[PDB]
Amino acid sequence: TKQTARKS
Amino acid sequence: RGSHMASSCAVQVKLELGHRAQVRKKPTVEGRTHDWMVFVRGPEHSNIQHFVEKVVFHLHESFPRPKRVCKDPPYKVEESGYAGFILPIEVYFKNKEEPRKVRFDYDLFLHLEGHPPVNHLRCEKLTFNNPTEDFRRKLLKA
């Protein structure tokens, strides 16, 4: 995929 | 719209929610790998300040000052970071009766470097049934 890691 | 009246009113407003994101060619001291700007605005630059009190951007708790407040256009926050998150947006209306605010959960997402920058657009329609006449004025000047 093309987007980065996500935080939470 | 009381029983013994013959008219009723319904007004619809359009809001645009969006953000842009590009990989900072030069990282930050803390390691923030991207720069992003998120906004709430009205299509074709129509002034939504007529009926918008303020917009509140709730940033992830990793930001200092996560509750960002925008009482005047443009309604945006420019920041830097390293990962995508959910950002909830509150829009408060210049109205003395509830509806006073609406919340949206906005998906602030970042693309990897070597991919194009993100420019993302969300359009949202809101419907006010029989508004007060003073709020109906504000709503329909925009």
Fold of B10-141: Immunoglobulin-like (2.60.40)
Listed by start position, the domains of chain B span 10-141
Q: Which residues of B touch A7 (CB under 8 A)?
A: 60, 62, 82-85
Instruction: Kindly list the distances between the CA atom of residue B104 and the CA atoms of B51, B61, B75, in Å, as whole numbers in the listed order.
Output: 17, 18, 15
- Report the alpha-carbon distance of residue A2 to residue B14 in Å, rounded: 30
CA distance B122 to chain A (A): 18
Tokens for A1, please give them.
């995929």
Tokens for B92, please give them.
């408060």
B114 with B70: CB under 8 angstroms? no
Q: Which residues contact B6 (CB under 8 A, 6 or more apart)?
A: none
- Report the alpha-carbon distance of residue B82 to residue B67 in Å, rounded: 19
- 3-state SS assignment for residue B87: strand
**Closest residue, chain A, to B84 (C-alpha):** A6
- Report the alpha-carbon distance of residue B35 to residue B50 in Å, rounded: 30
- Report the alpha-carbon distance of residue B141 to residue B31 in Å, rounded: 45
Q: Which residues contact B64 (CB under 8 A, 6 or more apart)?
A: none
For chain A, state the CA radius of gyration.
7
**Nearest one of B121, B45, B30, B132 to B79, comparing CA atoms:** B30
CA distance B10 to chain A (A): 39
Contact A3 B110 (CB under 8 A): yes
B84 with A5: CB under 8 angstroms? yes
**Lookup result for tokens 């939504």:** B48
Breaks (C-N over 2.5 A) in chain B follow: none
CB pairs under 8 A between A and B: 35
Contact A5 B109 (CB under 8 A): no
Among B107, B110, B120, most A C-beta atoms within 10 A, so best to mutate, is B110
- Report the alpha-carbon distance of residue B63 to residue B57 in Å, rounded: 12
Q: Which residues of A touch B34 (CB under 8 A)?
A: 4
